[PDB]
Amino acid sequence: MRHLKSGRKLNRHSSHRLALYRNQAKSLLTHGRITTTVPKAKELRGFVDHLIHLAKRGDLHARRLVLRDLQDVKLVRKLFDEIAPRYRDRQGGYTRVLKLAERRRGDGAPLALVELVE
């Protein structure tokens, strides 16, 4: 019974879900747009929104917080420099999720791209 329990297991154990979120986020910031299965996307909305929110906060403590997950200096720099400004006046909704019409051939999985909002 998953009553009110939030979050998707995604058929990965805990640390694997977490590293998935980190790698997904890394590619997202590194590219803005990425293509991934739908549930990974919707389970990636919040995990990106939080990091970008700390981007909007921008202080050192946020630097080490987001750095706790991204684990990169350069990519975090781009985050606090290219993205923190461009989302400086947006409250939430830092990412957009669109479902693609064409499923993945290899398994019939449905695809959808997650993009940083403009």
């Binding site: 669109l98 693609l100 019409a101 993009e115």
Partner: protein, 59 residues
Amino acid sequence: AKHPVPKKKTSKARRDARRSHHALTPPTLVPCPECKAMKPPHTVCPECGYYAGRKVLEV
């Protein structure tokens, strides 16, 4: 567990009967408002690459 096994051969009418619900619903399509092409709703038109009256993907 003593290896349960089908008792008798399934008659053809019964087989087809169980396969009755095996029909494949046709994938519902709506015309892309951009290029007038059919495609699944609530998705990006892979033809035009637009969505919500604006561009999303690079066709």
